[PDB]
Write a protein that binds this ligand. Structure first.
Ligand SMILES: *C(=O)/C=C/c1ccc(O)cc1
Length: 124
């Protein structure tokens, strides 16, 4: 249905969704495996970043797609949460690789499905 950015049970709602449904979200949604490889990437995210969602699948988010996020402030928090098993964290960030510098709010949250982690993004 409608689901809001930052919802307490967002991972429950998104677990139920196909590509088209993920594409209809109000916010960018990326699913990563524990190594940061991109499993899913929705249309809303591509509208923020200019990436083609169909072609970033399989790439590594931190190494290749989003090098500006390779930092203790973003990637560091991702890996801490993958390790702890309790990934659920929110912060502001600026995305600026091969796009106009864009201020965003990011929410990372463990998925219900195996070896899966969400990165949610909205403009601020
Ligand atoms: C910094 O390099 C961020 C880049 C970026 C963030 C999010 C995406 O979906 C794509 C590229």
């Amino acid at each position: 249905e409608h689901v809001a950015f930052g919802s307490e049970d967002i991972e429950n709602t998104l677990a139920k969704m196909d590509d088209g449904q993920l594409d209809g979200l109000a916010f960018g949604a990326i699913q990563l495996d524990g190594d940061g490889n991109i499993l899913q990437y929705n249309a809303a995210e591509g509208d923020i970043t200019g990436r083609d969602p169909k072609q970033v699948i399989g790439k590594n988010f931190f190494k290749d797609v989003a090098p500006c996020t390779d930092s203790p402030e973003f990637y560091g928090k991702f890996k801490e949460g993958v390790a702890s098993g309790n990934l659920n964290t929110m912060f502001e960030y600026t995305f600026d690789y091969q796009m106009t510098p864009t201020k965003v709010k990011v929410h990372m949250k463990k998925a219900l499905s195996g070896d899966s982690y969400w990165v949610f993004v909205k403009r601020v």
